[model samples]
Target chain A: KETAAAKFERQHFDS
Target chain B: SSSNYCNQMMKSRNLTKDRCKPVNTFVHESLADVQAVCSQKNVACKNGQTNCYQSYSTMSITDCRETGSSKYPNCAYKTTQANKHIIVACEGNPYVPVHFDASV
Candidate 1:
């Protein structure tokens, strides 16, 4: 959950 | 729904850097904790400890700042490889609250 969320968060920010 | 709104930033962040806010959204997080980060960075870390006095109004916006407060104010004296509880003097008096951060 943490990694996916962080990745989602990162990608979300990147986008 | 107004300008120059009212906000609350917790005293639980007495040791190290941590983010606070009920909502996880970064934008709201910005308004909520920007005061804190800015305050921490601007404050001087004297003798490996920072003592923050005066209004805690800045505590409300710590996260939004670039430096996370000049040097992370207050919260010195670590015990048991942890931190001693914080003593906050917000609005010129003691302002204690629940839900402090043990870690991220």
Candidate 2:
């Protein structure tokens, strides 16, 4: 389980 | 791989300032497949929310971790890429991935 904030930030990043 | 890599990224993304973001997992995926996890058969989630599901198939993922001695503005990271069956939690109505719960 994770907070929506962490989830939101975790997505989409390029190498 | 490079010294400025994470520092530049973290700065560019506004993830520094307060401190380096401890960890982040970059998923190389489309929202369509990720969203579909919300529809998979409900699975056990540690938080006891039934809103979690497992990916129908393994997916490629990248994880970045902060290395110690990495201070606030000067954060350092290690990167690793792997393919794994991932679990995530969802919030619905539109149903979307809200958490990278686990990988197995």
Candidate 3:
């Protein structure tokens, strides 16, 4: 499962 | 992020930018560590927004600024020893840093 933190990173930090 | 930290961060933070910003800073912490500030104690930004956070630990950082050439594509920077507890503005779903407010 994708961790919430990882998902959060992809959601916000990538930009 | 190291010496290249500022170079990468300058672009990532949108400071190097459409045009070269006079001054900018970036925390050298891991992305995961920096992102965890979303859960940290909330603080007021210099602009009085309630979205800023301060790191619990002092972090390595780099400050980039126009030292000499202020012209476009010729934005020269003098990278030097600068470390502090950074203040950042966080927003959106995952609460990532969107602005580098200051280092103190």
Q: Among these predicted structures, which one has the highest TM-score?
A: 2
lDDT of 1 by residue, B1-104 (tens): 11111111123221123422222111123322322332332232333333332223322221222223223333222111211222221221122111122111
Root-mean-square deviation of Cα positions for candidate 3 versus the true structure, in angstroms: 6.3
- CAPRI class of candidate 2: acceptable
The digit string of per-residue lDDT tens for model 3 on B1-104 reads: 21454555555555565667676654566787887776675789999998888877677766666666557654556665455776767777866776666567
Which residue runs does candidate 1 get wrong by more than 4 Å?
A: A7-15, B1-25, B28-63, B66-69, B73-104
Residues B1-104 of candidate 2: C-alpha lDDT, one tens digit per residue? 23545555555656665667887766667756767778885797888877779987887877677887676556788776788777887885677777777876
Residue A15 lDDT in model 3?
Answer: 23
TM-score of chain B of each: 0.15, 0.82, 0.74
Docking quality band of candidate 3, CAPRI definitions: incorrect
List DockQ, one per candidate, in order: 0.03, 0.30, 0.10
What TM-score does each prediction get for chain A alone? 0.50, 0.47, 0.54
Superior by DockQ: candidate 1 or candidate 3: 3
Residue A13's lDDT within candidate 2 is: 36
User: What DockQ does predicted model 3 obtain?
Assistant: 0.10
Task: Name the best candidate (by DockQ).
Answer: 2
